[PDB]
A paper describes a structure:
The enzyme responsible for 2′-O-methylation at the 34 nt wobble position of the isoacceptors and in [name] was recently identified by mass spectrometry and designated [name]. However, there is a group of minimalist [name] members, which contain only the catalytic [name] domain and lack the extension domains. Our results demontrate that the minimalist [name] Mtase EcTrmL functions as a homodimer by engaging residues from both subunits to bind [name]. The overall structure of an EcTrmL monomer subunit is composed of six β-strands and six α-helices, in the order β1-α1-β2-α2-α3-β3-α4-β4-β5-α5-β6-α6.
By solving the crystal stuctures of EcTrmL in apo form (2.0 Å) and in complex with S-adenosyl-homocysteine (AdoHcy, SAH) (2.0 Å), we identified the cofactor binding pocket and the potential active site. The space groups of apo EcTrmL and EcTrmL-SAH were P32 and P21, respectively. Both crystals contain two molecules in one asymmetric unit, forming a tightly packed dimer. Structurally, the dimer is formed in a ‘perpendicular’ mode, i.e. one subunit (green) is rotated by ∼90 degrees with respect to the mirror molecule of the other subunit (cyan). The N-terminal half forms a Rossmann-like fold, which is common among SAM-dependent MTases, whereas the C-terminal half forms a deep trefoil knot. The knot is formed by threading the C-terminus (residues 121–157) through a hoop composed of residues 78–86, which forms a hydrophobic core that stabilizes the polypeptide knot. EcTrmL contains many basic amino acid residues, comprising 13 arginines (8.3%), three lysines (1.9%) and five histidines (3.2%) in a total 157 resides, most of which are located on the protein surface. SAH binding does not significantly affect the overall structure of EcTrmL.
Residue numbers in the entry:
A (entry chain A), B (entry chain B): 0 to 154
The structure:
Amino acid sequence: MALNIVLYEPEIPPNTGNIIRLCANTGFRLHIIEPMGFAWDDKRLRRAGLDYHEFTAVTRHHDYRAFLEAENPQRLFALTTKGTPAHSAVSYQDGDYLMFGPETRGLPASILDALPAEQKIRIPMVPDSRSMNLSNAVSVVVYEAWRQLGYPGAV
Amino acid sequence: MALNIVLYEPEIPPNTGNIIRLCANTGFRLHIIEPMGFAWDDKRLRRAGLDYHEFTAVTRHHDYRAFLEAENPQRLFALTTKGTPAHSAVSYQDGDYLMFGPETRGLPASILDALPAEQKIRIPMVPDSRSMNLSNAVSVVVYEAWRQLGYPGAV
C-alpha cells in the first residue's frame, strides 16, 4: 500500500508528533514541506514518545516544487474548508497524496488553483463550526482512506 | 441526531479541549465521568480557544453508575485494543453512546465485562503499533459514526 500524507509548513510540534504516530500505526508515509514552524529538536515534538523507527516514515522537502519533483504525485488531494466533496465522498486509491495546510492558514492559492474541484475535499461540519485540530483532521481523512481500501496491512 | 461521546476519567487537558471542539463541530454530545486528571481552570484546556457555547455540549457525571442512572444509554460501545470488530464494522444508530478510557490505561474490567463482544470496538492498526492520541481516536470513531448516518446537521 502506497498512501501519503503531505503537511505544508506545519506550525505546532505536537500535531506533527501525533501525525508521525498516525503514519506508523497505519502504514501511511509522511511528507513535510519546509519550512516548519519549529525545530525537530523541539521538546514538544517527542512528548509523543516517538521511537526511532517511527521517524523512518518521514521525508522532508525543501519546498512544494521540490516535493513535486521528488514524488511526482499521481493524484494530489487537498483538505480545505473551500473544498466541495466530503473527504468520504471521493474514492482513494494507491499512489494518492493527501495534503494539508498549516494550523493557522489555508494552503496557498497558487497550489489550490492547480487542483480540480473534485480533488479539494472538506470535512463535514455543523454551521458556524470552529477550526478542527490538524492532527484530528488528518486522522479522520487517513482512517477514511484506509477504510475504503479495506485496511491493508492492519492486524 | 442523538450521538454521545463518553470520556472515562480523562487525564490530559488538550485532549479534552480538542474533543469539546469536535463535539461542537459535529453536533455530538460529550459526557465526562469524574474524576478528571486536571481542573476545568487548567490553562492547557482552553489553549483551544473554546467559546462559551461550546461548553454547553458537556455534561459531567460523578461516577460511572451516576452516568448510567442519568443517561440510561440504549447502547454503549467501548473503544478498546481488546475489542473485536473494527470501529467501522458496526452499525451506529441514534441514541448510541461511544465510550473511551483514559489516555494511559484501558477502561476498567468491571465495565468492559458488562458489554457484549460486539460492542467492544477497536481502531485497526499495523502490527507493533503504539498508542494513538486519544483525541485522534475519538475523532476517527465520531466521524465514522457520523458518516454512517449521512452527516445529519452538517452544512
